[PDB]
């Protein structure tokens, strides 16, 4: 199945274990600029095939991937470096520092599988 291409379970692992050694393969579902007012910042809704999670921000060094439309919704990418930070109220956020587009949005064409929003509380 198409979801055989994605690292099922990696979103829960990122948010619960925080081991930055995994190099999960994820699908970009949506990309939205974050209000900045300056360098633009991009928020990503990501999927591991089981869950979606919108608490991803691109490092600014990766902005050209979005702006030159090499990283776009439906593409499949491998995360090679990320960090997790925890906010005062307990919410966790993921900063994507290095990644590789494995399959372009045009080659994938659709959201893979039926992922459901991650339950973070």
């Amino acid at each position: 199945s198409m979801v055989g291409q994605l690292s099922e379970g990696a979103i829960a692992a990122i948010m619960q274990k925080g081991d930055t050694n995994i190099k999960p393969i994820l699908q970009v579902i949506n990309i939205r600029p974050i209000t900045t007012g300056s360098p633009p910042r991009y928020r990503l809704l990501m999927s591991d095939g089981l869950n979606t999670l919108s608490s991803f921000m691109l490092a600014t060094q990766l902005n050209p991937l979005v702006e030159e439309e090499q990283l776009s919704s439906n593409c499949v990418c491998q995360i090679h470096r990320f960090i997790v930070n925890t906010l005062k109220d307990g919410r966790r956020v993921v900063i994507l520092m290095e990644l590789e587009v494995l399959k372009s949005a045009e080659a994938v064409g659709v959201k893979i599988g039926n992922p459901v929003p991650y339950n973070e509380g």
Binding site: I34, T35, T36, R41, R43, S54, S55, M57, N85, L87, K88, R91, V93
Partner: peptide, 14 residues
Amino acid sequence: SLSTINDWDDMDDF
């Protein structure tokens, strides 16, 4: 909310 850049970082926020 995570819709503004300040939301992503509390310790830089005064």
